[PDB]
């Protein structure tokens, strides 16, 4: 069953700021991953890279909030 | 991953399961048993005009108690 | 020759008609077995039947189990 | 009431019949009198099975045949004229208060359904096309559907012989 | 009491004719993703929370589109058959069985029977009303289809019948209470797939609406609220089948979760097969009903009328 | 194995020589395989497995690419590091334009230099070939890697000195990085 | 029955009811002369296009019909066989069967829905 | 199918127990409401031409059976003075009023 | 299944086709006359549009038309280059052909595993030419350009 990825999910879910905070990231996103903040933009836009993914996956940007 | 496709069936085999719970509620409610008495023979067809003419009611059903009391002889 | 020669064509019929051959034969084992009873003084009886002692019919009615 | 409405809705549909020309028309005709008749006499037989039957061969299969081969579209679509409707409806609604009217009973077939059967009858407690059907298979009455079924044979052994014009 | 009964025999009716509807058209989405499972694609996921109201958002767009009617006296013929089409696809659940009365409807393999003959005029006149050849073609091979599979679908219920010693279809049930059918029947499982997967025209045999030989068949010609109606048909077509398949073959648990779970891996199956397989030729097929169907189907009528034979003998 | 059926000499592969045997074992395993549809359940049991594999479907535009560094998209019209413009006027790359869509005219500014007045590109008749850049003998002109440039009416696309200067000074980091990567490759 | 008239005259209302509904729900626009003419990938339809009815398809039906009545003839065997005299029931029914399958057999020999054309 | 035969035969069993109950209860009603349904043919056609009761005008209906035959009315003639809500009641009950 | 091209004027008799007349020419571009007025070089990408399914084999023809009219010969590299191209077009245009007859059919699932892996090969041509098709990667004189270091190990993986 949960081997070990209900973990995985506890991790993203809460760290993102609870419910409200992993439903709305879900919401915009249409998915959940998690990466290291390789930079953040001059534009309030925040990159975050992951190498666990494969290429299309490696490489993903969360743009400014503003943006809703 | 595959929970992707959870969403859909879980809904659809929610919505099918609904009916059945929604007859059986209304009925155990709405009745005072959960299952309408079946009429595919003549014989249950009888039994309801039997029960349905000793009262309005078949469902609400007269227990033993409905004998006279006594014969004083 | 024809033996395979079917077997090889028409799978499904050969495999379909050697299960009709074995039906009709149990099927008369089935009559066979059915009359080896005699298979009318059925132990149970549709409607209420009711016989005056000393009829025919009362004098054969089985006395069994079921 | 359920009875005299479709004589009702049999009478109209009928003088729908009788004016419909278009082909389709006809058949589309057809199509609501089989559910109709079907309806009527399941009402006063013993039960809705020879209903299920007639409907399946009459309408489900053999009047395929003639909306098929009445294709003929006439090469147009239908012309509807919402004045036979109006006059179906009309006519409809004042056989319906009449049929409201009319005496309750006696405007009522007299056969007997299996609920209008008596209490005692011990045979009406079986399964409802047992007792009818049975001898339709058991002898001597039953050799008539080898007959019926030969006769099939030769039908198609007719069609062959008919649709089968050089081509 | 009676009225009562009778109240309720229509809130039964008319809930189930809600859940249907609103369960086929939230299966639709149930197809998109899962096929999109099958081939490596991802399938909707954009709309709403995973593309969970996908569904409604094709409604929405269906309604709104016009309804571009064709030639013109056409309006009321070209508005009849989806009617006609959806009302049987619906209306066909009602003799389903349940333990919890819905009806006392005997005789529900006849009406089975009935009512899946009848798509024939639903498709046949809806091509008619079309008047274009491409949508002409489609109803005619739409017609044989359905018309040639119903000879081997009745003989393959009596096997089951005779299996179960009446029409009444619930005493599947009682017959059942030990060990599955499927088990017992398992050719029999693969044939009426084939065949319920003809009725509701899905491929392989896919000929009716079809495509890339057809446009669309019979649907071609078919604007928004029509073909709406036209696709809920279908669908809820295709689940009953499902349901049929589970009622017969796998329980009949009607007041168990998992028959419901059972209808939704019997739907999936039929997609399952969707992604797979290629589309029959015309003639093909009708070997495949005729030449091969029907013998199969007249071999086991003629095996189990001697096994109930012998079964009577015995007891 | 069974034999073949046309004797096959090297260079060559009959891909239909393998004969269908006769014998009984043969003619019964395809049977059986008819009547249970053997060969469909193999391909029905394959799409169930390959649910099990993650689909490649890039989440654009949040994840998105890959490209390379020798991509050929929007065009733009680059600057010395002194900010002058590149472009000489030389018209090769008009020349040689497959499908002319592009137009020159040149004059001299009043310094006295060699410069454009009007340099045109028409990105309904350009065929994004590079033939341009490959021949522009100072890297005026270069197919900057944008190619999210769509527009809703035909007028926007044809691109004026004015348009193409612009695109140059906003993409100038990334088409330094390609050149960086290529110039001594190219 | 009238039970189940009834509900299949309430759907019916309400599915007529919605098809109405999205009726005027859908935005409407001029009529086009081209707009409604036949679809036939984009070029002109031909000639009145109502098809040839000298092909085959009655003739299938026609075999629909056949095996659709005898299908009719075999449904009541469920029922009757706990009633029925076996031996009846037993031949009677078998022949059924039998001479349809010989039928088939026969025709398959004959094989006319391999026609020339 | 020896368990579905074991319980379809226990309400077979059950089934001949309960019935001359039935049977006994009925009959009271039947003579009951003849005697009524006698009552009233007398006293409706008080004033009619040459009104005989239980025949047509005379004859009797039924003649070969011997005399204190007694020959169940049809179902319409034991309804003869009821309305529609009494008819329907038992007629329309396989449908369900 | 017409290429969206084709047009069949089919006349048939029950269902089956008698007569077959296929209109080819609803996309006659007027390229030969095109490919007169412009130069060989400006004319090499003309080729690559005609048959676009096969990307390099179309100007790998028209490229040794021009070397035997200008007797010139290639190095072994841009031999081997186009060679490795050619079969790698060759790959591209039957999965396309398989993809397409799959879908004639109606069979979906084989046309979307192979168009998975037709992106990998469009990724290569991306990679050497900087285009996704239609390249103008050869040319008379051999390949226009050398090829990016590490491409040969990812083409090993991909054949892998
Ligand atoms: C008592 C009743 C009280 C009513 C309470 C409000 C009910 C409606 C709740 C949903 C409203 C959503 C409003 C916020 C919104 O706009 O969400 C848009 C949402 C996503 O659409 P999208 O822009 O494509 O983003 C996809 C991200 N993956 O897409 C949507 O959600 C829009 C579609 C919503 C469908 C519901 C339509 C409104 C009426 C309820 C149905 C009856
Ligand atoms: C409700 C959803 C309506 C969808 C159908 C529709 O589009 O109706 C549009 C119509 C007004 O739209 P519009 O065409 O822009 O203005 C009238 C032009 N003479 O809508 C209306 O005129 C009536 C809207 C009533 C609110
Ligand atoms: S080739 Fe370069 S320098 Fe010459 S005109 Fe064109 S852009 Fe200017
Ligand atoms: S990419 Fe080719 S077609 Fe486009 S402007 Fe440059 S040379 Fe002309």
Known sequence: LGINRLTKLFQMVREAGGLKQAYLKLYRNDDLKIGTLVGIDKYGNKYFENPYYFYGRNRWIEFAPHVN | MWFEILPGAVIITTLLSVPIYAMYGLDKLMIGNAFRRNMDERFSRVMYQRDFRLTDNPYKMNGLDAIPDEKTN | SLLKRAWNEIPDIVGGSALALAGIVMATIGVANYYAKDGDNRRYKLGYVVYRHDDPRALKVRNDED | MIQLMLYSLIITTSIIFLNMIHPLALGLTLLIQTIFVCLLTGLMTKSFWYSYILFLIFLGGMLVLFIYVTSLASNEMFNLSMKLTLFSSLILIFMLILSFIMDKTSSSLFLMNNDMQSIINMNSYFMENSLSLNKLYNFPTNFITILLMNYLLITLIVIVKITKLFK | MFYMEFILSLIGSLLLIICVLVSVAFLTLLERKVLGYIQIRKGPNKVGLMGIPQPF????????????????????????????????????????????????????????????????????????????????????????????????????????????????????????????????????????????????????????????????????????????????????????????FCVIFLGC????????????????????????????????????????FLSFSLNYLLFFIGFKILLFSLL | EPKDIVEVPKGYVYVNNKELSMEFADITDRAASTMFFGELLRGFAVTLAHIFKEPATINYPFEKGPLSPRFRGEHALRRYPSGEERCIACKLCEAICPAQAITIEAEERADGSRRTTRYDIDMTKCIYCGFCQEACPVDAIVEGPNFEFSTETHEELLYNKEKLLCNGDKWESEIASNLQADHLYR | MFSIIFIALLILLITTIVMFLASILSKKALIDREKSSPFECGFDPKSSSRLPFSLRFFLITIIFLIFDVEIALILPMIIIMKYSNIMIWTITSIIFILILLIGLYHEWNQGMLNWSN | AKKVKRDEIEMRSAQN????????????????????????????????????????????????????????????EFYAHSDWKSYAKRAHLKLWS | AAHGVLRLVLELDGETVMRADPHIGLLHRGTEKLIEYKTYTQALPYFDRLDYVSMMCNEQCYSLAVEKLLNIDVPLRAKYIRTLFAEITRILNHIMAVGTHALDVGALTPFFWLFEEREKMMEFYERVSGARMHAAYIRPGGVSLDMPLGLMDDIYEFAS
């Open chain 5, 57 to 244: 958002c094709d409604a929405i767009k269906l309604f709104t589109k016009e309804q571009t009617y064709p030639l013109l006296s056409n309006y009321l013929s070209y508005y009849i058959s989806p009617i006609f089409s959806l009302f049987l696809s619906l209306f066909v659940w009602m003799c389903m069985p349940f333990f919890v009365k819905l009806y006392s409807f005997n005789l529900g393999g006849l009406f089975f029977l009935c009512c899946t003959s009848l798509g024939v005029y639903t498709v046949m006149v809806a091509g008619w009303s079309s008047n274009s050849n491409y949508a002409l073609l489609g109803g005619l091979r739409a017609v044989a289809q359905t018309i040639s599979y119903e000879v081997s679908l009745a003989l393959i219920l009596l096997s089951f019948i005779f299996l179960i010693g009446s029409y009444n279809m619930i005493y599947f049930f009682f017959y059942q209470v030990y060990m599955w059918f499927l088990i017992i029947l398992f050719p029999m499982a693969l044939v009426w797939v084939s065949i319920s997967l003809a009725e509701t025209n899905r491929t392989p045999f896919d000929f009716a609406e079809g495509e890339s030989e057809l446009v669309s068949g019979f649907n071609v010609e078919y604007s928004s609220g029509g073909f709406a109606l036209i696709f809920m048909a279908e669908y809820a077509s295709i689940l009953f089948m499902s349901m049929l």
């Open chain 8, 17 to 76: 127990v309960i019935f001359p109950i039935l049977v006994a209860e009925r009959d009271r009603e039947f003579l009951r409401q003849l005697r009524r349904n006698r009552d009233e043919e007398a006293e409706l056609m008080k004033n009619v031409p040459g009104w005989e009761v239980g025949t047509w005008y005379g004859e009797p209906v039924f003649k070969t059976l011997p005399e204190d035959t007694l020959v169940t009315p049809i179902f319409k």
């Open chain 5, 253 to 292: 648990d009607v007041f168990n979760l998992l028959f419901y779970m059972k209808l939704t891996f019997i739907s999936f199956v039929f997609i399952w097969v969707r992604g797979t397989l290629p589309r029959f030729r015309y003639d093909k097929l009708m070997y495949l009903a005729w030449k091969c």
